Design a binder for this molecule. Structure first.
Ligand SMILES: [Zn+2]
Lengths: 86, 87, 191, 160
């Protein structure tokens, strides 16, 4: 028996490095990890606090979003209302 | 909480991979033909049916001579309940 | 009888165009009308991978047909046994058609060596016929060139090879005369 | 044990290979002066014992001539077959007679020319037919038969 051949480190290293490296978290989940937007300071502040919702109408603003989700800061296009900001 | 090892890293990293230190812990370590013929007939007197490997484990001697002594006076049964046995 | 002449025909063809084990299996079926697979294996003491290609060869020539017979005896085991049976008419038809194909294929090779026509090119290893040869003839040259190499060609075929195709016809007829005579003897009764 | 003296006596008389006197057999074995070995030898049909003087005959097969070989072949039609050991032990060098017995007078199967050739003992009629040229055999294997009912139709169009 050998302790170097039983316990491998490339399973945890490749799993964490691969999951935090690619968009997938293992397709189940995709688009979790995104490159940080360094266009300005408010883009990084509004980028880190950005919350996503996977695909009643979920795009419309609900009354329970008072004080929790910004009623104005939301992108336009296909992902309108699915992306939210704290 | 989780304890952070504060050492110079190189010691622990040396203990990780190859460190020229193995073992240190026990875990999952795990002839005259006539006389041989007479002895074989004595074993036949004890019991007629015996496997060739068992005879090689009882007579305790070079096995080639024992095989040649079994191919002359005994017949090898390959099938049946006494399979792989000389009688 | 007529049935025995078919047996002698199969002995002459299988013995004359194949090895020994083929007539071993053949005679093993001529002795027992229904020959099991376990009987032929324990008979010739040959392996399964050695009994396979023999039966497959005797079936590819339409010599014998197989009959996978069921068995549910003692131990309730579905023991299947491939019983071989000689297919006389299909085997005779196979012999006649194969002889005809041998004669026709050995007659075509004699007409090619009777008169050389085409050429050959050593440089590009491409064959050229008389047509392309006379179509690649130039005025400043005295020999037929080659489009790939623009170099002269060498005359292909010769009359020396014509003596080989005739000996194959004569020897083939001398070795096929008893077979075709047995065929003409069997085809009288259509059995 | 006396059984080892019995089997040793039979192996010794097989090493001799010719009938000798019973007393001479007991003298060649030195210490084997038992009569129970002689009685067990009389009970053994493997080595036939002639009551006239001292004579020990050896069976597998009494075949040593090509005619006896042909008879032993005829005694295997629609049955099984023996091996090479019995014939080569009953008659030295049988493969020479096999090569001399041309055209199905003695058949075999040449496997390897390095392992004494595991033989075969069957009989037919001709079996030779090596006059068939190899070219005719190659032209016989290249013919692809039309399967199903295409072959009888292709033969009825030619007139056969
Ligand atoms: Zn060319």
């Amino acid at each position: 028996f050998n302790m170097k051949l039983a316990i491998n480190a490339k399973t945890i290293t490749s799993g964490l490095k691969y999951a935090l490296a690619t968009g997938n978290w293992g397709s189940s989940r995709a688009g979790v990890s995104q490159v940080l937007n360094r266009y300005t300071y408010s883009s990084t502040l509004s980028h880190l606090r950005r919350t996503n919702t996977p695909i009643a109408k979920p795009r419309q603003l609900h009354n329970t979003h008072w004080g929790l989700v910004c009623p104005a800061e939301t992108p336009e296009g296909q992902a309108c209302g699915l992306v939210k900001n704290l | 909480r989780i304890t952070t090892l504060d050492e110079t890293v190189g010691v622990t990293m040396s203990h990780t991979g190859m460190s020229m230190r193995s073992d240190n812990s026990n875990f999952l370590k795990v002839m005259p033909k006539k006389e041989i013929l007479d002895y074989l007939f004595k074993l036949f007197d004890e019991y007629d049916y015996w496997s060739l490997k068992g005879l090689k484990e009882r007579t305790r001697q070079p096995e080639a001579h024992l095989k040649e002594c079994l191919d002359k006076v005994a017949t090898l049964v390959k099938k049946g309940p006494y399979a792989f046995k000389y009688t | 009888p007529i049935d025995d002449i078919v047996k002698n025909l199969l002995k002459f063809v299988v013995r004359g165009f194949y090895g020994g084990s083929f007539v071993l299996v053949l005679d093993a079926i001529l002795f027992h009308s229904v020959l099991a697979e376990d009987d032929l294996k324990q008979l010739l003491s040959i392996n399964k991978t050695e009994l396979g290609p023999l039966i497959a060869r005797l079936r590819s020539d339409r010599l014998i047909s197989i009959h996978k017979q069921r068995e549910y005896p003692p131990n309730s085991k579905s023991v299947e046994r491939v019983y071989y049976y000689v297919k006389y008419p299909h085997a005779i038809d196979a012999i006649k058609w194969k002889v005809h194909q041998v004669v026709q294929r050995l007659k075509d090779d004699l007409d090619k060596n009777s008169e050389p026509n085409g050429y050959m090119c050593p440089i590009c290893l491409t064959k050229y016929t008389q047509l392309e040869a006379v179509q690649l003839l130039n005025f400043d040259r005295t020999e037929f060139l080659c489009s790939l190499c623009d170099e002269p060609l060498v005359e292909d075929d010769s009359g020396k090879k014509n003596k080989e195709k005739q000996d194959k016809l004569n020897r083939l007829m001398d070795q096929i005369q008893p077979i075709i005579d047995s065929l003409k003897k069997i085809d009288d009764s259509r059995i | 044990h006396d059984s080892s003296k019995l089997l040793w006596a039979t192996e010794y008389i097989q090493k001799k290979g010719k009938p000798v006197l019973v007393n001479e057999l007991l003298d060649y074995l030195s210490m084997k002066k038992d009569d129970k070995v002689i009685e067990l030898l009389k009970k053994l049909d493997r080595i036939e014992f002639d009551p006239k003087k001292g004579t020990f005959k050896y069976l597998t097969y009494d075949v040593h001539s090509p005619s006896e070989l042909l008879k032993l072949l005829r005694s295997q039609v629609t049955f099984k077959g023996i091996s090479c050991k019995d014939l080569k032990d009953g008659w030295p060098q049988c493969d020479e007679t096999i090569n001399q017995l041309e055209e199905d007078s003695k058949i075999l199967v040449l496997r390897t020319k390095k392992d004494k050739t595991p033989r075969y003992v069957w009989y037919n009629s001709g079996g030779n037919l090596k006059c068939i040229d190899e070219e005719f055999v190659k032209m016989w294997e290249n013919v692809q038969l039309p399967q199903f009912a295409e072959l009888p139709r292709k033969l009825q169009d030619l007139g056969l």
